[PDB]
Amino acid sequence: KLPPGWEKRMSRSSGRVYYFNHITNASQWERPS
C-alpha cells in the first residue's frame, strides 16, 4: 500500500508505470517508500 496522496499511473507514451502525488503534484518513476 502507498502513502497518502500517491497513485500508480501509467505513461500513455512509453507504457511505463510511475507515481503521482495528488497532495504535492510531485511525480516520480520509483514507487515511493
From Swiss-Prot:
One GO CC term, this protein: cytosol
Residue span, WW domain: 1-33
One of the protein's GO biological processes: negative regulation of amyloid-beta formation
Keyword Aminoacyl-tRNA synthetase: no
An MF annotation (GO) of this entry: peptidyl-prolyl cis-trans isomerase activity
Compartment list: Nucleus; Nucleus speckle; Cytoplasm
Tissue-specific expression: Expressed in immune cells in the lung (at protein level).
Sorted UniProt keywords: Acetylation, Cell cycle, Cytoplasm, Isomerase, Nucleus, Phosphoprotein, Rotamase
Domain commentary: The WW domain is required for the interaction with STIL and KIF20B.
Function: Peptidyl-prolyl cis/trans isomerase (PPIase) that binds to and isomerizes specific phosphorylated Ser/Thr-Pro (pSer/Thr-Pro) motifs. By inducing conformational changes in a subset of phosphorylated proteins, acts as a molecular switch in multiple cellular processes. Displays a preference for acidic residues located N-terminally to the proline bond to be isomerized. Regulates mitosis presumably by interacting with NIMA and attenuating its mitosis-promoting activity. Down-regulates kinase activity of BTK.
Assembly notes: Interacts with STIL. Interacts with KIF20B. Interacts with NEK6. Interacts (via WW domain) with PRKX. Interacts with BTK. Interacts (via PpiC domain) with DAPK1. Interacts with the phosphorylated form of RAF1. Interacts (via WW domain) with ATCAY; upon NGF stimulation. Interacts with PML (isoform PML-4). Interacts with BCL6. Interacts with FBXW7, disrupting FBXW7 dimerization and promoting FBXW7 autoubiquitination and degradation. Directly interacts with RBBP8/CtIP; this interaction depends upon RBBP8 phosphorylation.
Listed name of the protein: Peptidyl-prolyl cis-trans isomerase NIMA-interacting 1
Organism whose genome encodes this protein: Homo sapiens (Human)
